[PDB]
Scaffold this motif. Sequence first.
Motif, PDB file in Angstrom:
ATOM      1  N   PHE B  45       0.876  -1.081  -0.071  1.00 35.30           N
ATOM      2  CA  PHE B  45       0.042   0.083  -0.197  1.00 35.30           C
ATOM      3  C   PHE B  45       0.758   1.229   0.025  1.00 35.30           C
ATOM      4  CE2 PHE B  45      -3.896  -2.307   0.421  1.00 35.30           C
ATOM      5  CZ  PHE B  45      -3.495  -3.565   1.139  1.00 35.30           C
ATOM      6  N   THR B  46       1.886   1.199  -0.925  1.00 32.27           N
ATOM      7  CA  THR B  46       2.924   2.398  -1.152  1.00 32.27           C
ATOM      8  C   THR B  46       2.506   2.834  -2.828  1.00 32.27           C
ATOM      9  OG1 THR B  46       4.674   0.696  -1.571  1.00 32.27           O
ATOM     10  CG2 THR B  46       4.225   2.093   0.755  1.00 32.27           C
ATOM     11  N   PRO B  47       2.480   4.278  -2.975  1.00 29.53           N
ATOM     12  CA  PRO B  47       1.939   4.889  -4.292  1.00 29.53           C
ATOM     13  C   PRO B  47       2.931   4.623  -5.352  1.00 29.53           C
ATOM     14  CG  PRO B  47       3.047   6.496  -2.808  1.00 29.53           C
ATOM     15  CD  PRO B  47       2.488   5.354  -1.848  1.00 29.53           C
ATOM     16  N   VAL B  48       4.293   4.742  -5.295  1.00 24.01           N
ATOM     17  CA  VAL B  48       5.160   4.462  -6.400  1.00 24.01           C
ATOM     18  C   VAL B  48       4.968   2.923  -6.799  1.00 24.01           C
ATOM     19  CG1 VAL B  48       7.471   4.632  -7.638  1.00 24.01           C
ATOM     20  CG2 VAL B  48       6.955   6.274  -5.460  1.00 24.01           C
ATOM     21  N   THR B  50       2.886   0.812  -6.228  1.00 21.78           N
ATOM     22  CA  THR B  50       1.632   0.551  -6.974  1.00 21.78           C
ATOM     23  C   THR B  50       1.795   0.996  -8.652  1.00 21.78           C
ATOM     24  OG1 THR B  50       0.564   1.043  -4.939  1.00 21.78           O
ATOM     25  CG2 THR B  50      -0.827   1.303  -6.897  1.00 21.78           C
ATOM     26  N   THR B  51       2.276   2.144  -8.887  1.00 20.43           N
ATOM     27  CA  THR B  51       2.504   2.283 -10.103  1.00 20.43           C
ATOM     28  C   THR B  51       3.506   1.551 -10.970  1.00 20.43           C
ATOM     29  OG1 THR B  51       3.990   4.137  -9.944  1.00 20.43           O
ATOM     30  CG2 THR B  51       1.675   4.826  -9.677  1.00 20.43           C
ATOM     31  N   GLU B  52       4.490   1.107 -10.218  1.00 23.28           N
ATOM     32  CA  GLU B  52       5.138  -0.078 -11.058  1.00 23.28           C
ATOM     33  C   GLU B  52       4.661  -1.379 -11.056  1.00 23.28           C
ATOM     34  OE1 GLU B  52       8.599   0.387  -8.262  1.00 23.28           O
ATOM     35  OE2 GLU B  52       9.584   1.884  -9.444  1.00 23.28           O
ATOM     36  N   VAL B  54       1.349  -1.982 -11.554  1.00 20.57           N
ATOM     37  CA  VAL B  54       0.361  -1.656 -12.718  1.00 20.57           C
ATOM     38  C   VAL B  54       1.240  -1.653 -13.870  1.00 20.57           C
ATOM     39  CG1 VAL B  54      -0.964   0.167 -13.687  1.00 20.57           C
ATOM     40  CG2 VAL B  54      -1.321  -0.483 -11.342  1.00 20.57           C
ATOM     41  N   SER B  55       2.202  -0.778 -14.070  1.00 18.20           N
ATOM     42  CA  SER B  55       3.262  -0.663 -15.269  1.00 18.20           C
ATOM     43  C   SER B  55       3.643  -2.234 -15.728  1.00 18.20           C
ATOM     44  CB  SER B  55       4.225  -0.026 -14.975  1.00 18.20           C
ATOM     45  OG  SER B  55       5.297   0.452 -16.100  1.00 18.20           O
TER      46      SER B  55
END
Lengths: 240, 246
Positions: B45-48, B50-52, B54-55
Amino acid sequence: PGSIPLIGERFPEMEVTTDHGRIKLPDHYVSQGKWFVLFSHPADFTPVCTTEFVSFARRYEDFQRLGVDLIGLSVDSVEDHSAWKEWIERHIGVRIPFPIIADPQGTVARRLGLLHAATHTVRGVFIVDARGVIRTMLYYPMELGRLVDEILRIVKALKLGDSLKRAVPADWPNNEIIGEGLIVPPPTTEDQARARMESGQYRCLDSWFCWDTPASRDDVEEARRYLRRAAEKPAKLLYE
Amino acid sequence: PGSIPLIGERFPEMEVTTDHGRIKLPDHYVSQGKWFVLFSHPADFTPVCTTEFVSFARRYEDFQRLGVDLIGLSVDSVEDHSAWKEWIERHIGVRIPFPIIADPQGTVARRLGLLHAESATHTVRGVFIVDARGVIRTMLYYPMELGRLVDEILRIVKALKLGDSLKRAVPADWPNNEIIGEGLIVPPPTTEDQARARMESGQYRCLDSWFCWDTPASRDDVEEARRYLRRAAEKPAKLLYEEART
């Protein structure tokens, strides 16, 4: 296995020979308030490393604009360096303007833990900030030339997160969730996480995923310039 | 400082708990003649991070096509892992196919030299790239606050695969190099007659004895590589933030 400096630690205090002169690290650059990328090589007159130098050369002013000096490193004499720089200008046309730490014996490679054994290894990149603290480390192998434009992306984006107090997300400025959006540090307390939702001043997907777009248009387009360049099939080759 | 493994070492033999079950490393992936990429993460549950994820997901087919499995690592429970995956399905709209190694406390991570602390787990941000003889070929240590460029990992494995398959080294920025474009490099000669014989064949284009090359990568190879970089480059048409009130 082997020992190395760590992200967030302060660059190994050292005095070194380059082919532009003796200087100190990280001091030479800290005093000037400049960042530097340090990038290492096994021996001079290697073709992969040659392409890497040529690629760094072309993007030299790009680094200068950011406030970012370059410095190479190989385990040959300064004389080997000079002759190799000459070979590249003469045979390729490009002048290399950055210095190259000379490290026979491999004492600096060892100090920095690029050497542990075989020289052989040693294709490492350090990105140090202007407090002289290590920010990122890439280890590409000897058989695989670096993608120099991603190095530009990483410094640009670090600088931009530092200045605005923002984290930065997978593939930014073309992130697929938030695009050129930068990320707001998560809230360490619950009264912070709560008042961050009901504020309604950031765009949130949950308490811990908030972002905005405080990066100006010129920081964004510069960053995309870097990638497009990487993507571009090049106009003229320099071999011909 | 800290100790870490080294490019050209074997990946440490070990057995890891994941949300897909127990899997064994690097054997599980060596067993299928498969490369794998392992990327670490400070907490769930950390933002960056999370985007890695998904990527990485959105590129899973690219990876599957290359023969490359993916496996993540963060210091939190298989509960959180799985819970974090539900969140990303429910809020971003993307199903994370790959496994995530569970490692609260963070022993598996210390064993890899991905944390050298203490208690403060801010540091855990490496990527290993491991081939099919189970050997580390590349490692990147980004920082917590800076998400990776996944199309660059795609480039590396592509380049590394081609290098080995063709017995070539790969120039800076390949396939879009300044000096030789898409060309791959011939392993520099060791002796004196090696240098002469090679010029007396013209089979390679060559600046000097130690800088020869040819163009042996099939269009296919080269076009997919270039596609990795374009995708990287293009401003995205649709953002998943918006295509997500749906």
